[PDB]
Design a protein around this motif. Structure first.
Motif, PDB file in Angstrom:
ATOM      1  N   UNK A  68       0.805  -1.215   0.000  1.00  0.00           N
ATOM      2  CA  UNK A  68       0.000   0.000   0.000  1.00  0.00           C
ATOM      3  C   UNK A  68       0.841   1.270   0.000  1.00  0.00           C
ATOM      4  N   UNK A  69       2.161   1.159  -0.121  1.00  0.00           N
ATOM      5  CA  UNK A  69       2.999   2.340  -0.184  1.00  0.00           C
ATOM      6  C   UNK A  69       4.236   2.272   0.686  1.00  0.00           C
ATOM      7  N   UNK A  70       4.173   1.516   1.779  1.00  0.00           N
ATOM      8  CA  UNK A  70       5.311   1.390   2.688  1.00  0.00           C
ATOM      9  C   UNK A  70       6.250   0.327   2.133  1.00  0.00           C
ATOM     10  N   UNK A  71       7.175   0.759   1.283  1.00  0.00           N
ATOM     11  CA  UNK A  71       8.111  -0.138   0.643  1.00  0.00           C
ATOM     12  C   UNK A  71       7.625  -0.616  -0.714  1.00  0.00           C
ATOM     13  N   UNK A  72       8.551  -1.217  -1.456  1.00  0.00           N
ATOM     14  CA  UNK A  72       8.231  -1.731  -2.780  1.00  0.00           C
ATOM     15  C   UNK A  72       7.238  -2.882  -2.684  1.00  0.00           C
ATOM     16  N   UNK A  73       6.345  -2.962  -3.665  1.00  0.00           N
ATOM     17  CA  UNK A  73       5.347  -4.020  -3.685  1.00  0.00           C
ATOM     18  C   UNK A  73       5.999  -5.371  -3.958  1.00  0.00           C
ATOM     19  N   UNK A  74       5.378  -6.425  -3.435  1.00  0.00           N
ATOM     20  CA  UNK A  74       5.855  -7.784  -3.626  1.00  0.00           C
ATOM     21  C   UNK A  74       4.688  -8.683  -4.004  1.00  0.00           C
ATOM     22  N   UNK A  75       4.999  -9.757  -4.722  1.00  0.00           N
ATOM     23  CA  UNK A  75       4.009 -10.730  -5.169  1.00  0.00           C
ATOM     24  C   UNK A  75       4.466 -12.089  -4.657  1.00  0.00           C
TER      25      UNK A  75
ATOM     26  N   UNK B  59      -3.616 -17.347  -2.360  1.00  0.00           N
ATOM     27  CA  UNK B  59      -4.394 -16.664  -3.372  1.00  0.00           C
ATOM     28  C   UNK B  59      -4.619 -15.210  -3.016  1.00  0.00           C
ATOM     29  N   UNK B  60      -4.315 -14.308  -3.944  1.00  0.00           N
ATOM     30  CA  UNK B  60      -4.443 -12.883  -3.673  1.00  0.00           C
ATOM     31  C   UNK B  60      -5.901 -12.502  -3.454  1.00  0.00           C
ATOM     32  N   UNK B  61      -6.141 -11.691  -2.427  1.00  0.00           N
ATOM     33  CA  UNK B  61      -7.472 -11.209  -2.103  1.00  0.00           C
ATOM     34  C   UNK B  61      -7.699  -9.839  -2.738  1.00  0.00           C
ATOM     35  N   UNK B  62      -8.853  -9.251  -2.441  1.00  0.00           N
ATOM     36  CA  UNK B  62      -9.222  -7.947  -2.974  1.00  0.00           C
ATOM     37  C   UNK B  62      -8.850  -6.798  -2.046  1.00  0.00           C
TER      38      UNK B  62
ATOM     39  N   UNK C 230      -2.495 -11.376   0.865  1.00  0.00           N
ATOM     40  CA  UNK C 230      -2.367 -12.743   0.381  1.00  0.00           C
ATOM     41  C   UNK C 230      -2.903 -13.701   1.433  1.00  0.00           C
ATOM     42  N   UNK C 231      -3.825 -14.570   1.027  1.00  0.00           N
ATOM     43  CA  UNK C 231      -4.435 -15.542   1.932  1.00  0.00           C
ATOM     44  C   UNK C 231      -3.652 -16.844   1.832  1.00  0.00           C
ATOM     45  N   UNK C 232      -2.863 -17.142   2.859  1.00  0.00           N
ATOM     46  CA  UNK C 232      -2.043 -18.345   2.882  1.00  0.00           C
ATOM     47  C   UNK C 232      -2.761 -19.419   3.690  1.00  0.00           C
ATOM     48  N   UNK C 233      -2.804 -20.631   3.145  1.00  0.00           N
ATOM     49  CA  UNK C 233      -3.333 -21.795   3.845  1.00  0.00           C
ATOM     50  C   UNK C 233      -2.261 -22.872   3.822  1.00  0.00           C
ATOM     51  N   UNK C 234      -1.869 -23.350   5.001  1.00  0.00           N
ATOM     52  CA  UNK C 234      -0.740 -24.261   5.106  1.00  0.00           C
ATOM     53  C   UNK C 234      -1.004 -25.283   6.204  1.00  0.00           C
ATOM     54  N   UNK C 235       0.012 -26.097   6.480  1.00  0.00           N
ATOM     55  CA  UNK C 235      -0.019 -27.082   7.552  1.00  0.00           C
ATOM     56  C   UNK C 235       1.201 -26.865   8.430  1.00  0.00           C
TER      57      UNK C 235
END
Length: 668
Positions: free
Chosen positions: A211-218, A253-256, A260-265
């Motif tokens: 959102x502006x605080x630092x470079x965006x990441x994917x 999966x990226x949200x709106x 990022x919505x992470x689902x793990x074990x």
RNA sequence: GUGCUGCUGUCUCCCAGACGGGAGGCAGAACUGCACCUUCCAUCAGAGAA
DNA sequence: TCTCTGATGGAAGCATATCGT
DNA sequence: ACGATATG
């Protein structure tokens, strides 16, 4: 919000990311120094070695001259006000900068429109454009606007950087300033040194925001590993992360909402898939290795309002009025020890099925159906070996100091001579010889034997996880605390022996200290997990725990508040509410008749009481757990010990300090 | 990924020195086990131990 | 006298709102 | 509708 963190490893970091890391650290240190200088007050600076320097005002003035402030004194007031505003020192309501990093645009970039916008002001009501509410502007921004009008505010940063990365640098530097200033503010209250960022000494989290605080990441996930792509101004760099058992088998999966919505074990016993949200990432370097801090938000389990009202009702004293839970809650009471890890008793409101009956305040009785002990003796031989070795190390340290005294002085005191022969010699299991030259040789031989036995014990305590008996290994057991005590005693004995030749070492027993701390942390985590699992398995929503806040005790290993706080936090995260109960006389009072009984010392697991003039015995830990649960459910209905003083004519006057004593007294 | 957490071989540094102890570097062998919010900072105290 | 916890703090781990194209 | 700042 609720946060949970972990770290992942990136191996082949490109040179561009390393340059970004170093430049961000450099500009962050520059920002620390610039803000501290704009504060215009002498301060103490601490270097890597530890020496403290008193930075004079001349250094501040010439650094401001280098930055661009040719006449800092002429604009000293506005500079001070701006610096204080950035550090969140103004009143929290109507802040000049709600976020500190938001100050970069008016501070560094040229041709910035910051400070002349009214779009986000709440006075903007639509149902105009010319309503310029610039009269009520904050002092921090007003001073900032004035300095730019002077043409000296845009400073020459040491290295050119994009506005987004400058925001992360401001965030880190200003958070460090705010952390330091509060400590300094406390220092003058009593009537504080400064540490700057370094690439490897005192690193900071080079953060990347969406959102502006630092470079965006994917951030993505492939196979069983994450994939971080940082959008640097030079280009897009794709980083792969070493697979981690924490984020095992992740799906993202990226949200709106720019997240990022992470689902793990997480664990291996179950297949439960934890779900979290990632919005900011952090890069750190330690030991020449680059790590990414995944700090993700998570939603704690929902807690029913009826649980809250039940806790409020049960925790309140009797001389009060609270609404009844009126539902079928579950109350689980435990006590904490070291020979058993803990013991638990479970009850449900409104049921009585051939169990230990306990009254409930303003309700019917309850029968404890499930009562048990979790954690304890895994193998008797191993526990006995740790106990024997701990005692041997203890008495060995005593014997070594006595021998060091004897060799130099040549004589022993009456108390010491009796103590050595009666106690220390049998404890250390070493024959005593008068010749001091080879007495140390015999001592060294015994120390070598002790080290060999300790190595064997540790190898067994490791093989517990790597044999066909893997399944029988409990989640937690009493061997953890015994091994911690053995580690402490062995560290103590080795530290004494290493200085036997005395009539320093920059590293000494670092492996032992590291093992001690790691084992302590692992034991705490496993105990907390076991308690949470036991509470969840029985469906309990209320947990009454002995307040251990009031050797062979947990207090010698941990702080009294730390374990309690950790258990409260985990139970609340799992949607379970817990209350600490006064543990006085819980282990000495029978849970059947509410009378004082006998707690055996030869066998501390048996508690003797009298029922119908026939002596019965029970387990002394489930007894304590049931007493805790009964005390919680009865709202301290019955006391056992009363504090009182004698005034005259043999008539004692009862001392009333706590509210529980007051409530009980007026009920009789 | 950090820990629980080790073994064997070999090498380096340090403290006694000729009984010994501490801190590390590589290479192998057995193991598919349990759990995990963390980062940074400043003051003041508890411990133990020469 | 020296190290190492340990206490008890402090600061952190983003969101909406427009114009301009 | 998405990028560029800018501010709750």
């Amino acid at each position: 919000p609720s946060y949970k963190s972990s770290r992942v490893l990136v191996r082949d970091v490109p040179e561009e990311l390393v340059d970004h890391y170093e430049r961000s650290h450099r500009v962050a240190a520059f920002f620390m120094r610039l803000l501290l200088a704009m504060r215009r007050e002498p301060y103490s600076l601490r270097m890597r070695d530890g020496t403290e320097r008193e930075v004079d005002l001349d250094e501040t003035d010439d650094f401001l001259r280098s930055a661009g402030c040719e006449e800092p004194d002429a604009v000293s007031d506005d500079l001070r006000s701006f610096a204080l505003a950035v550090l969140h020192q103004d009143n929290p309501k109507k802040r000049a900068f709600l976020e500190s990093e938001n100050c970069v645009s008016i501070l560094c970039l040229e041709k910035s429109a910051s400070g002349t916008r009214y779009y986000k002001r709440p006075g903007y009501q639509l149902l105009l454009g010319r309503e310029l509410l610039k009269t009520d502007t904050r002092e921090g921004m007003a001073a900032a606007l004035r300095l730019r009008e002077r043409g000296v505010f845009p400073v020459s940063v040491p290295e050119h950087l994009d506005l987004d990365s400058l925001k992360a640098a401001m965030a880190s530097a200003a958070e460090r300033l705010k952390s330091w200033l509060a400590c300094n503010q406390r220092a003058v209250d009593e009537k504080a040194a400064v540490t700057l960022c370094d690439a490897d000494d005192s690193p900071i989290k080079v953060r990347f925001g969406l959102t502006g605080r630092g470079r965006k990441f994917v951030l993505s996930a492939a196979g069983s590993r994450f994939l971080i792509t940082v959008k640097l101004p030079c280009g897009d760099v794709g980083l792969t992360a070493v697979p981690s058992r924490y984020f095992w088998n992740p799906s993202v999966g990226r949200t709106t909402s720019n997240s990022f919505r992470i689902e793990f074990t997480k664990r291996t016993t179950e297949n439960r898939r934890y779900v979290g949200e990632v919005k900011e990432i952090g890069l750190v370097r330690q030991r020449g290795r680059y790590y990414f801090f995944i700090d993700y938000n998570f939603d704690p389990e929902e807690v029913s309002d009826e649980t809250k009202v039940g806790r409020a009702f049960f925790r309140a004293p009797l001389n009060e009025s609270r609404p009844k839970p009126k539902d079928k809650l579950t109350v689980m009471g435990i006590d904490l020890g070291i020979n058993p890890a803990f013991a638990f008793a479970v009850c449900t409101l409104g049921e009585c099925q051939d169990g230990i009956r306990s009254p409930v305040a303003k309700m019917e009785d309850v029968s404890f159906d499930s009562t048990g002990l979790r954690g304890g003796i895994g193998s008797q031989k191993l526990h006995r070996e740790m106990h024997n070795l701990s005692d041997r190390c203890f008495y060995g340290a005593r014997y070594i100091r006595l021998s060091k005294k004897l060799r130099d002085r040549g004589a022993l005191n009456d108390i010491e001579a009796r103590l050595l022969e009666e106690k220390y010699i049998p404890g250390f299991r070493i024959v005593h010889i008068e010749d001091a030259d080879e007495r140390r040789r015999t001592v060294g031989r015994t120390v070598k034997e002790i080290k060999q036995e300790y190595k064997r014990i540790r190898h067994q305590f490791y093989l517990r996880y790597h044999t066909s008996k893997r399944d029988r290994t409990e989640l937690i057991s009493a061997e953890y605390f015994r091994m911690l005590f053995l580690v402490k005693n062995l560290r103590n004995l080795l530290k004494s022996w290493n200085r036997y030749h005395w009539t320093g070492n920059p590293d000494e027993l670092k492996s032992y200290v590291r093992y001690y701390n790691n084992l302590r942390m692992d034991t705490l985590k496993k105990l907390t997990c076991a308690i949470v699992r036991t509470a969840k398995e029985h469906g309990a929503t209320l947990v009454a725990m002995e307040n251990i806040q009031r050797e062979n005790s947990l207090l010698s290993l941990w702080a009294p508040g730390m374990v309690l706080e950790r258990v409260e936090q985990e139970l609340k995260n799992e949607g379970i509410l817990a209350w600490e109960v006064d543990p006085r006389h819980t282990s000495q009072t029978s849970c059947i008749t509410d009378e004082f009984g006998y707690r055996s010392l030869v066998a501390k697991d048996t508690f003797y009481f009298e029922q119908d003039r026939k002596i019965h015995r029970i387990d002394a830990d489930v007894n304590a757990a049931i007493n805790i649960a009964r005390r919680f459910l009865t709202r301290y209905r019955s006391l056992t010990q009363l504090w009182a003083s004698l005034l005259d004519d043999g008539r004692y006057l009862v001392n009333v300090t706590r509210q529980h004593e007051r409530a009980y007294l007026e009920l009789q």
